[PDB]
C-alpha cells in the first residue's frame, strides 16, 4: 500500500469544496383584475 514503515500514507488528497448555495431571490408577482361596472342611472328630485 506504499505507506511509511508505520502506516503513514505518502500521498495527500484534496477536499474539493463545493460552490455553496445561492440565496433565493423573490420578485414582485402581480395578478391583474378589473374594477366594478357602472350601474343604471336613476333620477333624483333636486336640481344640479
Amino acid at each position: 500500500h506504499n505507506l511509511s514503515i508505520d502506516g503513514q500514507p505518502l500521498s495527500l488528497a484534496i477536499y474539493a469544496e463545493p460552490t455553496d448555495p445561492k440565496a433565493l431571490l423573490t420578485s414582485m408577482v402581480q395578478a391583474s383584475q378589473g374594477g366594478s361596472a357602472v350601474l343604471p342611472g336613476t333620477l333624483s328630485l333636486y336640481r344640479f
Binding site: 500500500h1 506504499n2 505518502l10 500521498s11
Partner: protein, 48 residues
Amino acid sequence: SSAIKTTRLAEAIAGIQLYINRALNRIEPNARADVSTRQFFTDWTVNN
C-alpha cells in the same frame, strides 16, 4: 496497489533477481546445480 510506480527496467531487475534467489536456495526443484556454481553466483552476496 496502483499507487506503486516503476519502470520496465526496474521490474525486469526485480523479476530476474527473484528468479535467481529462488534458484539458489534450492526452494526450486530440479535446479541445474551444475550452473549454480558459477562465479557470478559465488559473488551473489555483492551482486544481489
